[PDB]
Design a binder for this molecule. Structure first.
Ligand SMILES: [Fe+3]
Ligand SMILES: [Fe+3]
Ligand SMILES: [Fe+3]
Ligand SMILES: [Fe+3]
Ligand SMILES: [Zn+2]
Ligand SMILES: [Zn+2]
Lengths: 190, 190
């Protein structure tokens, strides 16, 4: 069934508008993280931005055309330090997966748009992990554990792949000479 | 002076919301142009998307924080063939530089935000050239002149830089073997 005139139609566009702004905000926060010396976090912001582009794309492809008026609130700014940006990003994700998407999914099911309702629910899952990632990094910054841990571990240079073993990432990579900012905890997800 | 409570504050966020959606739409149209076999046009859509990201960034940095409600209409879809996408993109740019930005600049000046008004006016200039580019490519497609002209000229392969001299781009690049889709008119802007 068509979406024309349905509340779901406006909800999809509203989600698209929000996801679109989130993509820009995350890319900006990614640039700020770079300036603040947090390369892994910067790349995480950029990856999240690209994933928001994909949520938006799925939503956009459901629309049938024409201009549609929407009424919604969005974050008017701002770009602060990385810790603050991570906190603000997490808060935005929280609202999306706890309030917005469940509401949109609910209304979709009500109006008879099952496929779309399920897509809203699925996107909410992605947003929750996005929040987890942001909250975890904010915590690392607050606890001063971004580049230092209590026990010896392995740190990988994102720039060249050098692996450093120790309680903390080195001031400079011994292989590529790039600063500590490029190091992350060595991760294996395969 | 602060922007809080001013119409300009809402106009900036509205512009940001629109520029944000345009970035996504242009990236999607860029992907469709690739599928349609128009590499130069695809790269132009991607470049325009990146520039929209920059208009949005300038606008975003003027905001002072907090959640703000906005009321505006946006294109609910859609992704069609490249010619149609170029036409729809041009129409959107036209509205922005003829109606929206001049109005926002006008109101900014009225409320006493000179710097911001001038930024709105400046962005409008960029949008007009964006439209010109889109309209020119739509015309090339309509006239069947994307890869063929009446007089012998030079065609450059965007993939490897090979330069072909003739009335039209070759079916396959003789250097890198990529399809005609990668060719553009050789351009010199320096
Ligand atoms: Fe999102
Ligand atoms: Fe998200
Ligand atoms: Fe624009
Ligand atoms: Fe534009
Ligand atoms: Zn290194
Ligand atoms: Zn070639």
């Amino acid at each position: 069934k068509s979406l024309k005139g349905s509340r779901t139609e406006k909800n999809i566009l509203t989600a698209f508008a929000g996801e679109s702004q989130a993509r820009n905000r995350y890319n900006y926060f990614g640039g700020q993280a770079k300036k603040d010396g947090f390369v892994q976090i910067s790349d995480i912001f950029a990856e999240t931005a690209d994933q928001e582009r994909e949520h938006a794309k799925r939503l956009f492809k459901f629309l049938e055309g024409g201009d549609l008026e929407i009424v919604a609130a969005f974050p008017a700014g701002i770009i602060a330090d990385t810790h603050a940006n991570l906190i603000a990003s997490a808060a935005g994700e929280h609202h999306e997966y706890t309030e917005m998407y469940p509401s949109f999914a609910r209304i979709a099911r009500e109006e008879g748009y099952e496929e779309i309702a399920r897509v809203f629910a699925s996107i909410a899952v992605a947003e929750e992990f996005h929040e987890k990632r942001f909250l975890d990094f904010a915590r690392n910054i607050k606890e001063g554990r971004v580049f230092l841990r209590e026990q010896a571990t392995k740190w990988r240079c994102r720039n060249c792949g050098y692996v450093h073993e120790g309680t903390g990432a080195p001031e400079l990579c011994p292989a590529c000479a790039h600063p500590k900012a490029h190091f992350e905890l060595l991760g294996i997800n395969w």
